[PDB]
Ligand binder design. Sequence first.
Ligand SMILES: CC(=O)N[C@H]1[C@@H](OP(=O)(O)OP(=O)(O)OC[C@H]2O[C@@H](n3ccc(=O)[nH]c3=O)[C@H](O)[C@@H]2O)O[C@H](CO)[C@H](O)[C@@H]1O
Ligand SMILES: CC(=O)N[C@H]1[C@@H](OP(=O)(O)OP(=O)(O)OC[C@H]2O[C@@H](n3ccc(=O)[nH]c3=O)[C@H](O)[C@@H]2O)O[C@H](CO)[C@H](O)[C@@H]1O
Lengths: 490, 484
Amino acid sequence: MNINDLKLTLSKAGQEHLLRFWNELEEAQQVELYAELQAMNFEELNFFFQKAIEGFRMEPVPREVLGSATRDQDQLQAWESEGLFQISQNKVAVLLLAGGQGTRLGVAYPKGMYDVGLPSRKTLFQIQAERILKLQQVAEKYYGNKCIIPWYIMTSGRTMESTKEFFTKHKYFGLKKENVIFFQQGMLPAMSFDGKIILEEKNKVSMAPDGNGGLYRALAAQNIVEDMEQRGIWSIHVYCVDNILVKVADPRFIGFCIQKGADCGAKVVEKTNPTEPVGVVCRVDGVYQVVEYSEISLATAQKRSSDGRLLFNAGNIANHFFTVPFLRDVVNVYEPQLQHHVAQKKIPYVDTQGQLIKPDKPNGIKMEKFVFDIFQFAKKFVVYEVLREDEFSPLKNADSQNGKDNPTTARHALMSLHHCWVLNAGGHFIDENGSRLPAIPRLKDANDVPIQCEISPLISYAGEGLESYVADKEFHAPLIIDENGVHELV
Amino acid sequence: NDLKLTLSKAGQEHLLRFWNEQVELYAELQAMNFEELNFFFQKAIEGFVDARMEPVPREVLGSATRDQDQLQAWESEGLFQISQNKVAVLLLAGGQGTRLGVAYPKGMYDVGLPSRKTLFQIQAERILKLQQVAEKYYGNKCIIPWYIMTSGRTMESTKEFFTKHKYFGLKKENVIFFQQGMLPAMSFDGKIILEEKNKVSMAPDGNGGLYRALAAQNIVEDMEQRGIWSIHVYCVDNILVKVADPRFIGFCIQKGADCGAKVVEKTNPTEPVGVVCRVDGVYQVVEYSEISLATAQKRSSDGRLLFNAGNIANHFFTVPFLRDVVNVYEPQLQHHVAQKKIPYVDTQGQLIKPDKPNGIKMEKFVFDIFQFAKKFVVYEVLREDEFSPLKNADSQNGKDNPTTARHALMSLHHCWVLNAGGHFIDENGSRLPAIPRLKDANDVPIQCEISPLISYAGEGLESYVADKEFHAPLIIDENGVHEL
Ligand SMILES: CC(=O)N[C@H]1[C@@H](OP(=O)(O)OP(=O)(O)OC[C@H]2O[C@@H](n3ccc(=O)[nH]c3=O)[C@H](O)[C@@H]2O)O[C@H](CO)[C@H](O)[C@@H]1O
Ligand SMILES: CC(=O)N[C@H]1[C@@H](OP(=O)(O)OP(=O)(O)OC[C@H]2O[C@@H](n3ccc(=O)[nH]c3=O)[C@H](O)[C@@H]2O)O[C@H](CO)[C@H](O)[C@@H]1O
């Protein structure tokens, strides 16, 4: 095949404009452009665009399928035991969605590498790794045997390299390299309203990850499910990379799903503010699903039930439970029934004059599948509600943006939680004179700051095991408790 | 050595320790009842509740959400009272700190709204609005006097600001300023700390100092002289505050109460809001800094926190009730204490900023009179509609800062437009969703601001936006519609 056959292929698909700058490119750019174009399926892309353009009631989930960490507190112990047991049997794996690019946070590296400013300065990646290590250890102490929790990590073309290097550089945070499986998701080109693929540069097609629902075709392309089956895994905990509080492989959530005989589960927190950007779990025509925040109407989002809570208050925190057999069915059957969700974006591009432009008005669409669109195909779906202060504080914005879900709110949510762990375990905080500080600080002066406390996951997964370190004792913050002991920072 | 002997019979001699180095230091000194200050300190520190706390009972709790079927009746009653000139508001603006990083009172703060209006102007226009609305609903020019409590630390700036903006359209004679007392800082041993070799460290005596301030300038008499029956007390820092809110006032009136507290649902155990509750039969607010974590995290069977009535510092008091407080109950009010790092001037004329707390500050709280009311009620509203406080600078702890304040207002006005049948569209004219996907560096939420003169709480917008599409930033004011 040569530049002649390619031109024909592109022309028949209505994409010949992709070669318009070909004679102005350096030889090395032509080699690169050529290669990228040869690895694209233009017919499939056209088909996807057609369905997308052509694509231009709800009921709460019944109480019977919703478990609550708060209301069903009497069952936590049983669910936790089940979860730890599954973990000790090596039947549990976690799968991290870390393919998201385009940093709105103002940086060029992936979110997993972000340092939210914790006293320990650990990145989201390391905190996650330590929670996995913690559970491996906890499981080994209540069952005696060493166990493994494989860590599948989905990266995209824009996060793969940097992510792999980062892990290598950190010696996998203490985990074994063989138990961390990286796999890349696919990508899709931005397309203008007329159906033409958009060139970002004269020799480069504007591309982006195909949405977190692209997990399924990625699993197929790299035989991940075969890997899970070979390892003997039964349960998979899928989660979002940006939540500093995520209970990776949370035994309570896993145990709940197992005990209920579910093949699919979704962890949620109560949505109280009508406009919070979280999808809502619900059902339509007896089929379970999530309606993304950007696709719900204000009337629906603000609807209240007789008790005063929002009618649709099951806020998706992107923490799901999938069994391996269900994933196999999704990968080999349902995947094609997943539809692309379309967003109208301002895509930077190169114009006919060869100049890079930042559109004042949206000039194209981005197609993406959502990871929760497979809920509808589950044989047995359940919902598990937890408290957000214990489990959900997302990093989506830079500090200079809208004021929420940023590095500042993330580190403060973690430190406040750990601060609470110490008080609940019997400890206290004091000032410079040994005076006891209240549970909620009076922040009146410029220099006043909240209590800084941080507990390593290796020491405590969710607040347990601290009494011997803090009971009846007082500490000067910042306080850190890790594998090296108790440390009060100066 | 007359006043010099005074300090002696109070162990406060050390104050003149720098006298031999003297005009204002005398004017400030001979205005302090040293006798009383020793009594306050001792009692405040004396002995250096959570178990006896009980939740707010359903009998006294009203909800704007759950009792939506009565908002019309309450709103009418409140508007009626306003038309009868029987309603006044009282702003607590004596507070002043270094927290926001400015040298002026919060009321003058500009959180960055499209209009750039300050909290004072927004509040003033809401007052103007209810007068305008009341005049049209009952045919008669009515008035809502605006009492503003300031401290010696905000008094001058405030008055100037108002005069500058010609009282934002309100009548000078209807805006009554009155100063609140002040209290001295003290060391743990009980000695009044001198800030400067010629200055005593002073600070306002808490928003609870309101009651003594009322007596000092005969504020209550004036209220009776105007025929006012209801007073709405509120905090200055909340950009969404519904000044003279007819619904809250109507609810209290209609319920025949002499004291009321507007609240929002506290969902996060460590949120810094006081919680309304009952202790040994009487209502109180247990301040966020005095509650234990065990109590704060306690949940009820429905999954909500047991003490979920978060005080948003918006109270209802009848003039008769206030009178009884200023002339009888005031003395029973206690002083809440807080350790502080007070800059001082030790021996050898050495001036320094403490690295460790070196004393305490005393304050009375405005809600500590709830316990004296005959009929106390609680009115629960939604925080997205009425509460988004300004307490911290953006560089601080990440909440209740200028950024969240302006976004909470713009999100609410954005919602008013949609609920009135309006629509927002992008540059191509495609309609935007109610909840935007903020994925790129330049993505921002829909910016929208509606002047109170146009809408007080989302009403009267149909003619302005029903079945219409706008390009945000969108501003709707007395000068019409503007797309920036
Ligand atoms: C589709 C989805 O999950 N929506 C949920 C996600 O929305 P958001 O819009 O907040 O997030 P998002 O879809 O952009 O990304 C969520 C997660 O998916 C990852 N990602 C995204 C695109 C991609 O092509 N590849 C990839 O791996 C990303 O790295 C992150 O871990 O989080 C919110 C909580 O904060 C909610 O629970 C929303 O319902
Ligand atoms: C005592 C009190 O009200 N506590 C409430 C107030 O606490 P905060 O500690 O957040 O506020 P704060 O007592 O410092 O000030 C509250 C209001 O009182 C004013 N002020 C304060 C001190 C003074 O000497 N003079 C004066 O006029 C200040 O200008 C503001 O308008 O707000 C929180 C959030 O909204 C809650 O609702 C707290 O329960």
